[PDB]
């Protein structure tokens, strides 16, 4: 009874492949010859943040483009001011293995997670004068890899037990779950209208999930290795993934197939963090050879290189107005390129 | 207005930096360890005698140590093992012994030893369950490995008296099978410290302390370009 079901699954995958080859009229690299190239990108390190001890694993910008969180591997979550390099907050954490952090769109709460399988949400109102543990969410059986805020009441998390989950912060229970992956979900990216979200896993697959319904819509399989990072396009119709096979890939939601592949012959290192600019013309990608690359998203050319880190780049973040790019690596240094 | 706000932010930054310097004085003096092994190897007896992760605090000669054994995680190890690159040593527990467990332990040890981000860390190898090997050698090690027949006891090692020669022969055979792939791509960057331990024993903590002493002394000799 297993041969006929897998045979029908192979026939459905062949029908999907035939539909994608039928919808593939022309590639993106053919009609972008009229668009002028950007050229050499010259950015400099304006600010440098040095207050961490162990390796910085993640960061997230605020909506005002002023404050930013940063999580380290010593049990520290420091909220920095990016303008004057003043440490605004420094939360000591329970477990020192942190893999993700997020900032609320209102600026009131900060979540974090890691190998303890528990998402800790802290409050920044400080009625007494200090921060404290506002909420602890414990419903996963694997390591928490990413977490993002929809609002002050709901939070989308992804864990290492092939499960994503939408949580309600007030009741302390899961609103809904997402069980469709076969590999460890590494990162997720929300929509600009917070209606859908993409999630890439370790089986070379990125799935598009609906928030309110709770079921997978589309599945994208174009990579060869583990997809480590993902980032939604600023308009809301495309996204980009980075994997360990030294290839970035720009996927579309409408055509249900890959549009472009960003690679090179000399790059043989994995990709840890990808992010778009405010206009979506540039695509920044953090690699494992101690520097980041700024690709042109419409010409597939390496327009610039950000080489100022001494260790492996772990996180990259672009502001909402597109004014600066904060890159954090494993040498406990946050560098603000502009 | 803005000047008093900047003064308050500078005072808050000075208090936060003082707290970070105190936490740096606490954090730089402690040595982290990664306890790793299979479920049937005997790491539960190790964490009893000596959530997704469990924390074990102890101290030797007024020197602090934290041991982080893996808890409720899955079988896939290729992503969360990269977070353990700042530890001082990996205490790798194997069971000296129906599936082939020794070959899986050798494959896991080879994948740790040849990892890109695990070239700086040293491995303290603990071959547990020696009395079980002493029982099972009397009445399947030679079947899983045909090199056990063409093998003699190394004369450079000093065994303890009152032991059967086949038991210490199997011990030295498994130790040489680990050191065959240990001494293939080391090149002086990191070493392996094999030890013969039992399930109920209290001398393992001194072995871990002496091996961490050896790791840190070799690191300080290597930073001065001497060794």
């Amino acid at each position, epitope marked *: 009874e297993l041969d006929q079901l*897998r045979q029908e699954a192979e026939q459905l995958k062949n029908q999907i492949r035939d539909a994608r080859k039928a919808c593939a009229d022309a590639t993106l690299s053919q009609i972008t010859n009229n668009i002028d190239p950007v050229g050499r990108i010259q950015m400099r390190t304006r600010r440098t943040l040095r207050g961490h001890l162990a390796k910085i694993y993640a960061m997230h910008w605020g909506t005002d483009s002023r404050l930013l969180v940063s999580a380290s591997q010593d049990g520290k979550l420091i909220i920095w001011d990016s303008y004057t390099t003043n440490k605004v907050h420094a939360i000591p954490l329970r477990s020192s293995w942190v893999m993700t952090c997020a900032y609320a769109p209102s600026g009131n709460y900060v979540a974090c997670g890691g190998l303890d399988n528990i998402c800790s949400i802290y409050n920044l109102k400080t009625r007494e004068g200090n921060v404290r543990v506002s909420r602890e969410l414990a419903g996963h059986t694997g390591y928490l890899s990413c977490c993002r805020f929809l609002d002050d009441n709901q939070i989308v998390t992804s864990s290492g037990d*092939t499960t994503c989950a939408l949580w309600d912060i007030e009741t302390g229970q899961q609103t809904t779950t997402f069980t469709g992956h*076969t*590999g460890d979900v590494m990162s997720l990216s929300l929509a600009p209208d917070t209606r859908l979200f993409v999630s890439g896993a*370790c*089986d*070379a697959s990125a799935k598009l999930w609906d928030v309110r319904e709770g079921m997978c819509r589309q599945t994208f*399989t*174009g990579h*060869e*290795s*583990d997809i480590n990072a993902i980032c939604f396009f600023p308009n809301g119709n495309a996204f980009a993934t980075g994997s*360990d*096979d*030294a290839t970035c890939r720009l996927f579309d939601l409408r055509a249900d197939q890959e549009l472009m592949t960003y690679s090179h012959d000399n790059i*043989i290192c*994995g990709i840890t963090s990808v992010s778009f600019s405010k206009s979506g013309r540039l695509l920044l990608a953090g690699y494992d050879d101690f520097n980041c690359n700024v690709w042109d998203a419409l010409k597939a050319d390496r327009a610039g290189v950000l080489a100022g880190h001494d260790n492996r780049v772990s996180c990259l973040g672009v502001t909402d107005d597109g004014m600066a790019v904060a890159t954090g690596s494993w040498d406990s240094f946050l560098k603000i390129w502009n | 207005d803005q000047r008093n706000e900047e003064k308050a932010q500078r005072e808050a930054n000075k208090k936060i930096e003082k707290q970070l310097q105190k936490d740096k004085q606490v954090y730089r003096a402690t040595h982290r360890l990664l306890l790793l092994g299979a479920g049937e190897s005997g790491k539960s007896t190790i964490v009893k005698q000596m959530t997704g992760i469990f924390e074990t605090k102890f101290q030797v000669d007024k020197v602090n140590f934290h041991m982080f054994d893996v808890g409720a995680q*899955r*079988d*896939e*190890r*290729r992503k969360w*093992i990269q977070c353990f690159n700042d530890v001082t040593a990996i205490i790798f527990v194997v069971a000296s012994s*129906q*599936t*082939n467990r020794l*070959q*899986e332990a050798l*494959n*896991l040890f*080879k*994948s*740790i030893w*040849n*990892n*890109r981000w695990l070239r700086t860390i040293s491995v303290i190898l603990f071959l547990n369950k020696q009395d079980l090997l002493a029982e099972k050698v009397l009445a399947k090690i030679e*079947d*899983y*490995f*045909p*090199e056990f027949a063409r093998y003699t006891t190394p004369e450079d090692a000093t065994p303890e008296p009152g032991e059967d020669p086949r038991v210490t022969r199997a011990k030295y055979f498994i130790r040489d099978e680990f050191l065959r792939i240990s001494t293939a*791509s080391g090149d002086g960057r990191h070493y392996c410290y094999p030890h013969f331990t039992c399930s109920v024993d209290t001398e393992n903590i001194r072995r871990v302390f002496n091996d961490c002493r050896d790791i840190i002394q070799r690191m300080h000799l290597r930073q001065y370009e001497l060794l």
Partner: nanobody
Amino acid sequence: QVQLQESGGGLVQPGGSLRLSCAASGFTFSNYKMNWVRQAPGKGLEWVSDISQSGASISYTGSVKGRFTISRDNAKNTLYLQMNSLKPEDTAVYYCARCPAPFTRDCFDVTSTTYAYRGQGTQVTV
């Protein structure tokens, strides 16, 4: 899309030979170290053998050493396993597995329960 397909098998006699094939689709074949891993009925998965990227480093299990031969053809994009002088204890489901990272020597999750970078396997009954 990464997909591996096995070929060969059937009912064989002890002391005979059998050639198992593995065809790849969706990736570059000459960059990944390749594995053969069996699973016996009633037991868990156990690693049999591996061949490197360029085909230089070839390693086996001790129980299968001297009776199995693992080879690869990067030009024809295939992985072969020659099984001469068989044993009745070798009745198992065989899988050809791919290590997840390119240009590396370490392979972590090859002999695991839920791994997505290998095929469906083939039954070899002696």
